[PDB]
Ligand binder design. Structure first.
Ligand SMILES: Oc1cc(O)c2c(c1)O[C@H](c1ccc(O)c(O)c1)[C@H](O)C2
Ligand SMILES: Oc1cc(O)c2c(c1)O[C@H](c1ccc(O)c(O)c1)[C@H](O)C2
Ligand code: NA
Length: 156
């Protein structure tokens, strides 16, 4: 089954600037997010199909997460990626897709439109705990990118 959820988050940063920084999330997030230690490309060049290995630290234990780049839509400020393996993927789940799209905020800032698609195996339903962790991670990244941009204004 596929379970779909929608959410919104705002930023002072304008969408073109925030999107360009999002494209560099692999190099940004290990720096700003304490739990994230590294992001390595295992397959592809960074485009759709590209597989990344994230090394994370949680409760003093090292764990890995696998992401697949689903789509990149520069024209629409859209970045889509799925969790396809590791600790962030419950056994019931086939995969979890995170869709981000930026649109202009009323005051020159940004609205981040988040879509979460949780793909279950069979008639399994999503784990709520895993879900809370996801949606959080949906923000915690957005904030990382935004904080980086605000802290390094020349960069973008
Ligand atoms: O607050 C967090 C905590 C995390 O463990 C993670 C967060 C944010 O975002 C990371 C992240 C998310 C998306 C990326 O494209 C990426 O390179 C890194 C990852 O989901 C792991
Ligand atoms: O398109 C996919 C879908 C998956 O479920 C996976 C994909 C790619 O690749 C992962 C993967 C994991 C480690 C690798 O070195 C590698 O090249 C690919 C894993 O097999 C799980
Ligand atoms: Na870190």
């Amino acid at each position: 089954g596929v379970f779909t959820f929608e959410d919104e988050i705002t930023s002072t940063v304008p969408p073109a600037k925030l999107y360009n920084a999002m494209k560099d999330a692999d190099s940004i997030t290990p720096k700003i997010i304490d739990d994230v230690k590294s992001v390595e490309i295992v397959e592809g060049n960074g485009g759709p199909g590209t597989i990344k290995k994230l090394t994370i630290v949680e409760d003093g234990e090292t764990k890995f997460i696998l992401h697949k780049v689903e789509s990149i839509d520069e024209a629409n400020y859209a970045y889509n990626y799925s969790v396809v393996g590791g600790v962030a993927l419950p056994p019931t789940a086939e995969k979890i897709t995170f869709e981000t799209k930026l649109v202009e905020g009323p005051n020159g800032g940004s609205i981040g439109k988040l879509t979460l698609k949780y793909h279950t195996k069979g008639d399994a339903k999503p784990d709520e705990e895993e879900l809370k962790k996801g949606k959080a991670k949906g923000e915690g990244l957005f904030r990382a990118i935004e904080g980086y941009v605000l802290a390094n204004p020349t960069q973008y």
